[PDB]
């Protein structure tokens, strides 16, 4: 059960407001299937506003761009304006690793691809850049953890 | 468009393109509607998380609760508490008043109802509890400048 990136984030998330610790809610599927032009996750963690998208491939040293599109990468380059902790959590799903990557990063890899630039991000650069995200029982994914280090004042 | 909801798209999209504020309209759940589990609105503003509500009525002379519900007041009390700002935005449809009230004020309210309390705010409540907000051309309805002059530092 729960092996998909999506159900882990789900479960993620249903522990971490049950237990007090963040409110964060995937939004719902827009109807009135069309496509959405915000990222699929946000919510509140210490009085700012945390925004996220979550994306696994199968491809085992880079990861495809294809993934997103304009309009997320436009409404995460607004809330980094405006703010908010906004990233992007990518799962190598054959690896069974997952990373937090700031949205600066995603945002600009995602215009060098636009300025002719390859259509997936290296691995490396993703080691790099990002962040190693704890796994567990639960939460699944522990990403309010490196989010604590990462964005706020120890 | 002439609903509360129209006047919100028009303002909340002004407030993106100028680079104030980026609140979106979460969809609804779903040929079967679900009822949501968050209040409908959010976003972030000056690094705040913002979080908000938007019932408009007929009634000149007192705003009805029943415009709410229990999930929505559950949802703004998690909200209050994990340091967002959180308010309800009133309309007096026939008035042409339009309110901001605190979340704490509305859930005070909201609560007392089960303890026999009226099913209803009298707008005379929400004058001295809450803020008039601005309408104009464009921005429609300027609850921005009201939540910066409320909940920032001048
Ligand atoms: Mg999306
Ligand atoms: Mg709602």
Redesign the interface.
Same mark, same amino acid.
């Given at each position: 059960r729960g092996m998909t990136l999506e159900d882990d984030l789900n479960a993620t998330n249903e522990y971490y407001?049950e237990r007090?610790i &963040? +409110?964060i809610?995937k939004? /719902?599927? /827009? +109807? %009135?299937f069309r496509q &959405?032009?915000?990222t699929d996750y946000? #919510? +509140? $963690?210490? #009085?700012? $506003?945390?925004?996220f998208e979550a994306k696994e491939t199968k491809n085992k040293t880079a990861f495809p761009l294809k993934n997103f599109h304009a309009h997320q990468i436009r !409404?995460m380059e %607004? +809330?980094v &304006? !405006? #703010? #908010?902790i906004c990233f992007a959590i990518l799962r190598f799903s054959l690896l069974n690793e997952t990373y937090l990557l700031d949205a600066s990063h995603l945002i600009a890899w995602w215009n060098k691809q636009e300025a002719g630039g390859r259509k997936s991000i290296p691995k490396q650069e993703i080691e790099r850049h990002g962040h190693s995200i704890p796994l567990g029982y639960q939460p699944r994914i522990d990403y309010i953890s490196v989010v604590d280090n990462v964005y706020f004042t120890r």
């Open positions: 407001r007090g &963040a +409110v809610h939004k /719902p599927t /827009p +109807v %009135q &959405a032009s915000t946000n #919510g +509140v $963690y210490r #009085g700012k $506003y945390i925004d !409404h %607004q +809330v &304006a !405006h #703010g #908010g």
